[PDB]
Symmetry: C2
Subunit: 87 residues, 2 copies
Amino acid sequence: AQKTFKVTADSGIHARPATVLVQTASKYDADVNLEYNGKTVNLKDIMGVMSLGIAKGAEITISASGADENDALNALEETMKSEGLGE
Amino acid sequence: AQKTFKVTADSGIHARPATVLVQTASKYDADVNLEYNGKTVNLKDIMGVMSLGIAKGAEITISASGADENDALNALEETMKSEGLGE
């Protein structure tokens, strides 16, 4: 499953935001990936999120795959809105 | 602990090389990471590894931390060399 979002967070996807993301994704039996410009990283590691250097205004795709993918994806979109990261 | 290497694979770190690295790193409990020109990704993440686009001649550093990080490292140097990826 996949969803595209626009980052609206002011400092882009920095330390706190990569963490709330890893945290939520970590709760699911599903492989969770983050994509920006053709580059994809596993979402369950802050290392590789920090590395993409995603700033405000960017568009990114979140994909999930596995037993719990619908729930995994719905949760991530809830954190993106609720943590004022994107929409 | 860490180890730096020089990539000598003509195609850099492409799908095959990334695959051998990841399979090797995955047998260990230590957290295992790859860094290239300031960007760091989890070595147990095929996606993140490919995202880096490491070409022939670059230098990369492999880091391993935890329980069996000396064996994780020797093991990765060995793959580095027997799989013709670098030295």
